[PDB]
Design an enzyme around this catalytic site. Structure first.
Site, PDB file in Angstrom:
ATOM      1  N   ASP A  48      -4.181   6.015   2.230  1.00  0.00           N
ATOM      2  CA  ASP A  48      -2.880   4.844   2.670  1.00  0.00           C
ATOM      3  C   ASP A  48      -3.593   4.211   3.843  1.00  0.00           C
ATOM      4  O   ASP A  48      -3.262   4.369   4.888  1.00  0.00           O
ATOM      5  CB  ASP A  48      -1.423   5.188   2.885  1.00  0.00           C
ATOM      6  CG  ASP A  48      -0.556   4.007   3.096  1.00  0.00           C
ATOM      7  OD1 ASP A  48      -1.021   2.761   3.109  1.00  0.00           O
ATOM      8  OD2 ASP A  48       0.745   4.314   3.109  1.00  0.00           O
ATOM      9  N   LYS A  88       0.658  -1.123   0.037  1.00  0.00           N
ATOM     10  CA  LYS A  88      -0.019  -0.147   0.016  1.00  0.00           C
ATOM     11  C   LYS A  88       0.876   1.241   0.085  1.00  0.00           C
ATOM     12  O   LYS A  88       0.716   2.126  -0.795  1.00  0.00           O
ATOM     13  CB  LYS A  88      -0.850  -0.108   1.167  1.00  0.00           C
ATOM     14  CG  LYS A  88      -1.879  -1.221   1.393  1.00  0.00           C
ATOM     15  CD  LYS A  88      -2.901  -1.040   2.383  1.00  0.00           C
ATOM     16  CE  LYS A  88      -1.809  -1.348   3.740  1.00  0.00           C
ATOM     17  NZ  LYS A  88      -1.275  -2.571   3.746  1.00  0.00           N
ATOM     18  N   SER A  89       1.747   1.299   0.954  1.00  0.00           N
ATOM     19  CA  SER A  89       2.736   2.524   1.147  1.00  0.00           C
ATOM     20  C   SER A  89       3.470   2.603  -0.239  1.00  0.00           C
ATOM     21  O   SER A  89       3.577   4.042  -0.787  1.00  0.00           O
ATOM     22  CB  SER A  89       3.486   2.609   2.378  1.00  0.00           C
ATOM     23  OG  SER A  89       2.678   2.588   3.256  1.00  0.00           O
ATOM     24  N   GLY A 101      -3.813  -1.422   7.446  1.00  0.00           N
ATOM     25  CA  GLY A 101      -3.864  -3.026   6.991  1.00  0.00           C
ATOM     26  C   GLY A 101      -5.019  -3.615   7.290  1.00  0.00           C
ATOM     27  O   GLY A 101      -5.827  -3.701   8.520  1.00  0.00           O
TER      28      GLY A 101
HETATM   29  N1  LIG Z   1       5.711  -3.277  -6.711  1.00  0.00           N
HETATM   30  C1  LIG Z   1       6.689  -3.340  -5.772  1.00  0.00           C
HETATM   31  N2  LIG Z   1       8.132  -3.396  -6.492  1.00  0.00           N
HETATM   32  C2  LIG Z   1       9.092  -3.279  -5.313  1.00  0.00           C
HETATM   33  N3  LIG Z   1       8.905  -3.339  -3.957  1.00  0.00           N
HETATM   34  C3  LIG Z   1       7.651  -3.359  -3.544  1.00  0.00           C
HETATM   35  C4  LIG Z   1       6.516  -3.324  -4.413  1.00  0.00           C
HETATM   36  N4  LIG Z   1       5.514  -3.251  -3.693  1.00  0.00           N
HETATM   37  C5  LIG Z   1       6.140  -3.651  -2.431  1.00  0.00           C
HETATM   38  N5  LIG Z   1       7.132  -3.719  -2.352  1.00  0.00           N
HETATM   39  C6  LIG Z   1       8.012  -3.709  -1.173  1.00  0.00           C
HETATM   40  O1  LIG Z   1       7.346  -4.366  -0.180  1.00  0.00           O
HETATM   41  C7  LIG Z   1       7.221  -3.885   1.167  1.00  0.00           C
HETATM   42  C8  LIG Z   1       5.852  -3.770   1.726  1.00  0.00           C
HETATM   43  O2  LIG Z   1       5.102  -2.625   1.231  1.00  0.00           O
HETATM   44  P1  LIG Z   1       4.589  -1.098   2.255  1.00  0.00           P
HETATM   45  O3  LIG Z   1       5.924  -1.615   2.726  1.00  0.00           O
HETATM   46  O4  LIG Z   1       4.136  -0.576   1.099  1.00  0.00           O
HETATM   47  O5  LIG Z   1       3.489  -2.166   3.014  1.00  0.00           O
HETATM   48  P2  LIG Z   1       2.048  -1.831   3.174  1.00  0.00           P
HETATM   49  O6  LIG Z   1       1.395  -2.727   2.079  1.00  0.00           O
HETATM   50  O7  LIG Z   1       1.998  -2.415   4.467  1.00  0.00           O
HETATM   51  O8  LIG Z   1       2.139  -0.441   3.159  1.00  0.00           O
HETATM   52  C9  LIG Z   1       8.151  -2.729   1.125  1.00  0.00           C
HETATM   53  O9  LIG Z   1       9.384  -3.005   1.620  1.00  0.00           O
HETATM   54  C10 LIG Z   1       8.538  -2.212  -0.402  1.00  0.00           C
HETATM   55  O10 LIG Z   1       9.727  -1.731  -0.654  1.00  0.00           O
HETATM   56 MG   LIG Z   2       2.397   1.233   5.032  1.00  0.00          MG
END
Ligand SMILES: Nc1ncnc2c1ncn2[C@@H]1O[C@H](COP(=O)(O)OP(=O)(O)O)[C@@H](O)[C@H]1O
Ligand SMILES: [Mg+2]
Length: 330
Positions: A245, A100-101, A248
């Site tokens: 955003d 998501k982030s 979870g």
């Molecule tokens: N399409 C993508 N390409 C590269 N890295 C990704 C991608 N989506 C997620 N990630 C990696 O996965 C982890 C999970 O995403 P965030 O961390 O976005 O979590 P959430 O969905 O909890 O917000 C992060 O370390 C991020 O760098």
């Molecule tokens: Mg996040």
């Protein structure tokens, strides 16, 4: 479309690597299928969306849905709807760690910026490159966290206390004493983002893990002022852009009764709202999130949601749940 829905699967993450997880998600066109790791000999459950983004590999792959691709399908058209005078919303929904982030803010480096910075950059680029003395603009921004029915100002380090959402008897809901900053350039709004993103992950945030238990709302008030030389007067057009955003979707164990209650209530309510919006071709006050964004979720508004998906077998239950949630959005 007043409601667009996209799903996006990411590369394996560390937990999945250490688990030697199999990929259970595959995509083709607008369709996403999911395999039940406990039942490999079936045909996978299928789902169809406005977009199924395959980002399970990497930019080196010819078929990898990049941050740029996602923004140009979903974000770009939203910004255009804002220039046309109406409000928009973009939500990132999904399990913690699903992406998501990354999809919304992404990374600080080259190539990895999410929807928010790309949309902001696009906005100022269109503004500065707008040639006309009768058209001037103003851009105001707010960045906050909604945690347990209370609001945290991410643009004010000493946000002293937790501000309440209130309902003005005439002009709608609003966050009391929330800072709204006027920005005149991209690097400036970019400064605010970085500053806000920083506040989301400081050490103290690990106490209640607010980075994954609160909803982060990035609001932009876009005002277009139209001059007219004939009979000399400006007409203002105001668009509200909300980039969210969400908390979870799995916390809707170890989750406190009230955190879970509120998050479930929030996500459940948002789901009803969007399905209703897609219906039209509504209980807003049921949660603080849907209450604060009512105006961006009206019949005039436009909404899009990007549901983040984990690829691994170990998250089958949550991922199916997310797909079903996206399928209901419509
Ligand atoms: N399409 C993508 N390409 C590269 N890295 C990704 C991608 N989506 C997620 N990630 C990696 O996965 C982890 C999970 O995403 P965030 O961390 O976005 O979590 P959430 O969905 O909890 O917000 C992060 O370390 C991020 O760098
Ligand atoms: Mg996040």
């Amino acid at each position: 479309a007043s409601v667009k829905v996209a799903v996006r699967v990411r590369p394996f993450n560390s937990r999945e690597m250490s688990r030697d997880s199999k990929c259970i998600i595959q995509m083709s066109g607008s369709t996403t299928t999911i395999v039940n790791p406990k039942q490999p000999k079936e045909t996978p459950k299928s789902f169809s969306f406005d977009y199924s983004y395959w980002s399970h590999t990497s930019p080196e792959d010819i078929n990898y849905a990049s941050q740029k691709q996602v923004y140009r399908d979903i974000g770009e058209e939203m910004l255009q709807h804002a220039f046309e005078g109406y409000n928009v919303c973009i939500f990132a929904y999904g399990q913690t760690g699903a992406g998501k982030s990354y999809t919304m803010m992404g990374k600080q480096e080259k190539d990895q910026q999410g929807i928010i910075p790309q949309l902001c950059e696009d906005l100022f680029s269109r503004i500065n490159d707008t040639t006309n003395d009768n058209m001037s603009y103003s851009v105001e921004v707010s960045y906050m966290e909604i945690y347990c029915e209370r609001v945290r100002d991410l643009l004010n380090p000493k946000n002293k206390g937790n501000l309440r959402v209130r309902e003005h008897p005439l002009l709608g809901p609003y966050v009391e004493d929330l800072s709204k900053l006027a920005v005149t350039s991209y690097n400036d709004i970019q400064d605010l983002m970085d500053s806000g993103n920083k506040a989301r992950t400081v050490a103290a945030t690990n106490m209640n893990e607010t980075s994954s238990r609160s909803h982060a709302v990035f609001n932009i008030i876009f005002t277009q002022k139209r001059h007219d030389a004939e009979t000399n007067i400006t007409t203002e057009k105001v668009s509200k852009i909300s980039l969210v955003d969400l908390a979870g979707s799995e916390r809707a164990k170890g989750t406190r009764l009230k955190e879970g209650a509120n998050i479930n209530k929030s996500l459940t309510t948002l789901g009803k709202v969007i399905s209703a919006l897609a219906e039209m071709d509504i209980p807003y006050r049921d949660s603080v999130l849907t209450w604060l964004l009512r105006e961006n979720l009206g019949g005039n508004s436009r909404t899009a949601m990007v549901a983040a998906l984990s690829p691994a077998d170990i998250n089958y239950d949550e991922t199916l749940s997310t797909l079903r949630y996206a399928d209901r959005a419509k």
